[PDB]
Amino acid sequence: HMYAIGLTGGIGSGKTTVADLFAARGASLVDTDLIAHRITAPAGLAMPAIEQTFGPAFVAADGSLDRARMRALIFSDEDARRRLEAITHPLIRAETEREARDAQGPYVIFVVPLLVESRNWKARCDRVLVVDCPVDTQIARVMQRNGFTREQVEAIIARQATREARLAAADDVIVNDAATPDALAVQVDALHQRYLAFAAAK
Amino acid sequence: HHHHHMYAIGLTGGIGSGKTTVADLFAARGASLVDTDLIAHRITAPAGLAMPAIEQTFGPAFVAADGSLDRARMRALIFSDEDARRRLEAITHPLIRAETEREARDAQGPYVIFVVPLLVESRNWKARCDRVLVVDCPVDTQIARVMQRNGFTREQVEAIIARQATREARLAAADDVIVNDAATPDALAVQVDALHQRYLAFAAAKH
Numbered sequence A: 001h002m003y004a005i006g007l008t009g010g011i012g013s014g015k016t017t018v019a020d021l022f023a024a025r026g027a028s029l030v031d032t033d034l035i036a037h038r039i040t041a042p043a044g045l046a047m048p049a050i051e052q053t054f055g056p057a058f059v060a061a062d063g064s065l066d067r068a069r070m071r072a073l074i075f076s077d078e079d080a081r082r083r084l085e086a087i088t089h090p091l092i093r094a095e096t097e098r099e100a101r102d103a104q105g106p107y108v109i110f111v112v113p114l115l116v117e118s119r120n121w122k123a124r125c126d127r128v129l130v131v132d133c134p135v136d137t138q139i140a141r142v143m144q145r146n147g148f149t150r151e152q153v154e155a156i157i158a159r160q161a162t163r164e165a166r167l168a169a170a171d172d173v174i175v176n177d178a179a180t181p182d183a184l185a186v187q188v189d190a191l192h193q194r195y196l197a198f199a200a201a202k
Numbered sequence B: 001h002h003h004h005h006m007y008a009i010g011l012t013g014g015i016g017s018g019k020t021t022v023a024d025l026f027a028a029r030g031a032s033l034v035d036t037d038l039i040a041h042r043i044t045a046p047a048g049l050a051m052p053a054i055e056q057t058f059g060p061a062f063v064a065a066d067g068s069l070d071r072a073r074m075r076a077l078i079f080s081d082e083d084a085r086r087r088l089e090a091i092t093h094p095l096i097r098a099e100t101e102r103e104a105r106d107a108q109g110p111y112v113i114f115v116v117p118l119l120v121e122s123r124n125w126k127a128r129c130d131r132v133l134v135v136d137c138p139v140d141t142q143i144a145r146v147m148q149r150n151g152f153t154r155e156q157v158e159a160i161i162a163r164q165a166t167r168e169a170r171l172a173a174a175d176d177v178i179v180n181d182a183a184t185p186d187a188l189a190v191q192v193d194a195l196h197q198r199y200l201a202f203a204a205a206k207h
């Protein structure tokens, strides 16, 4: 068993920021969001199924997913959300095992936005690391980064687990609410070490 | 590595109905076959993509000495414990779904046939296919064939048949049907020739 850490956290909480720090220290990163984008890019592994299931309406002229039109439809119709996720999730799952098999570091970190929401991911990981922060900080950061409105972010936040549920399912926690990310490194240093020890013991 | 608007046929049918037999005929005519059972075997063979998860979730008890799945011990346990069924299938099904897409992407033929035993029993497969082809036959013929070709008793086959969709349900979900109930498979080719042609047209009209 390659030692596996699930890194999760709500939208805008800091998963990417924390993940990078662990990568700089030699952890092997498998970002399920990068995979989700590539499998729906031009020539992506998920596109045949998506065209078939949704129609050429949702395939843009470059072959990729029309992320806009879809962005709307799965918000509008949560029968459609489940229909898309039923295509993408198994593929993401699969690409994850495949990247994990090839990973060269002493342990792996799977960056998984909807980790605790899913039964399968908790079982797949040796530990869960939650990057936590207040909901209003999530909102401000995601408005700033992606240009959305409150309502748009609030809508994603509502489709995700509460802070309390996330914190309850954690083995490890990094509260990322400082004005600045410079102090995160101290926390990541210590977790890295503990992770090396965990892995070595298994 | 590519091909826009790949045409896909789901080939299904109950145990012993003739999926393999019909599939082979289509392959001989240049259809690209993706057998989801071969994939299920491969991902649980030695070095298979599913084995880490299976050892982790179930223990080395169910990993045979060559690294593969102890298909026997498991065969029992998922029948014995339908909490275990769901736990194994949750590992294997997504990986099967994924390998299917990957084999379909690389397929060289004018259309692809997915051989999927439990096709209509699943919402996702119907939507994934342009058409469903059911290979149909009477239950007693399924039973005789599976007794002959795997050695089982009536009871054993009847037990699998009970876990699968009824004929009526399968026929209701079909676009195409081949009734495979003759003493012999020689006459199937005539039906496959015609379907092959109709499939070339369907695929062409999608391009």
Ligand SMILES: Nc1ncnc2c1ncn2[C@@H]1O[C@H](COP(=O)(O)OP(=O)(O)O)[C@@H](O)[C@H]1O
Pocket: A009, A010, A011, A012, A013, A014, A015, A016, A017, A018, A141, A142, A145, A176, A177, A178, A179, A180, A181
């Ligand atoms: N501690 C922090 N102080 C200020 N900005 C931060 C901090 N942590 C993250 N950010 C920024 O806010 C956003 C948080 O997003 P990110 O790290 O991508 O989180 P996630 O990947 O969970 O959505 C990014 O634009 C990032 O640069």
Ligand SMILES: Nc1ncnc2c1ncn2[C@@H]1O[C@H](COP(=O)(O)OP(=O)(O)O)[C@@H](O)[C@H]1O
Pocket: B013, B014, B015, B016, B017, B018, B019, B020, B021, B022, B145, B146, B149, B180, B181, B182, B183, B184, B185, B186
């Ligand atoms: N029309 C037929 N006449 C005689 N034997 C048949 C006929 N169709 C299939 N068989 C045999 O009966 C069994 C049916 O199996 P197969 O085509 O593998 O169905 P499936 O793949 O659905 O089990 C096989 O042993 C096959 O050789």
